PDB file of C-alpha atoms in Angstrom:
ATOM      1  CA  UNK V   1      -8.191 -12.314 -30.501  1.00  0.00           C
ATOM      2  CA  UNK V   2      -7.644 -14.185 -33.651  1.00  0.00           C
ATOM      3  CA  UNK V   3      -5.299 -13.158 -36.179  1.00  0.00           C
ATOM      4  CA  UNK V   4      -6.359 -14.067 -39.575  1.00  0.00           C
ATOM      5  CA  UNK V   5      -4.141 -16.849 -40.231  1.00  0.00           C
ATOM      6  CA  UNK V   6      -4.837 -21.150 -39.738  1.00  0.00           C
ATOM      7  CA  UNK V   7      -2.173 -23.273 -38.113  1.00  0.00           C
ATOM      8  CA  UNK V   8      -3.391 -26.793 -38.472  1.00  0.00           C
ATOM      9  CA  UNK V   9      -0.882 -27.686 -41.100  1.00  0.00           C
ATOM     10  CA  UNK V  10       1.787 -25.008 -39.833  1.00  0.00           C
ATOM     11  CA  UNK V  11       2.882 -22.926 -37.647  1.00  0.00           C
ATOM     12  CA  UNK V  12       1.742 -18.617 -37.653  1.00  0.00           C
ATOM     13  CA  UNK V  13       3.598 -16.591 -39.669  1.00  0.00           C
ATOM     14  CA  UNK V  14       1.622 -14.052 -37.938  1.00  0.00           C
ATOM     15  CA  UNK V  15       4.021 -15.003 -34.729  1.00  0.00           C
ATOM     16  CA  UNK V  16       6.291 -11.999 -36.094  1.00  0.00           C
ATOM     17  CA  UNK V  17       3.177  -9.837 -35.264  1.00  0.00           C
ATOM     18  CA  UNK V  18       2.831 -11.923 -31.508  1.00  0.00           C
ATOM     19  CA  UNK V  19      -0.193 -14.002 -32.875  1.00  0.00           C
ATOM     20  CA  UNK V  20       0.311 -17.988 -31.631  1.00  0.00           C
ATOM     21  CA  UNK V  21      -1.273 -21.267 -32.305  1.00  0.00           C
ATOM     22  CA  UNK V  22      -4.342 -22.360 -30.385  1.00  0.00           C
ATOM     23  CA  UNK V  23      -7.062 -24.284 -31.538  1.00  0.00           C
ATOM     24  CA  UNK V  24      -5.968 -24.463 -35.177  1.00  0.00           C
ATOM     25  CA  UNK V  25      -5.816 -20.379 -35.871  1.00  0.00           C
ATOM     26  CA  UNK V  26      -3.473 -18.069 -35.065  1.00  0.00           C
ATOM     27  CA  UNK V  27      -4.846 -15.293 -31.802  1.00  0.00           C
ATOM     28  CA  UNK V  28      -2.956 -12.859 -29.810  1.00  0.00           C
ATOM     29  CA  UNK V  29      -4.928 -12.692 -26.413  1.00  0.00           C
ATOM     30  CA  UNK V  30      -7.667 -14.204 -27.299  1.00  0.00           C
TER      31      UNK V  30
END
């Protein structure tokens, strides 16, 4: 589930809320 955030210049600030890096945008579980 995506986040809200990009990640193709950095990494998620949304990891403090268990989102991750995949395919340039930040998704917890798809």
């Amino acid at each position: 589930i995506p986040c809200g955030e990009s990640c193709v210049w950095g990494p998620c600030i949304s990891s403090a809320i268990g989102c991750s890096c995949k395919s340039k945008v930040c998704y917890r579980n798809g």
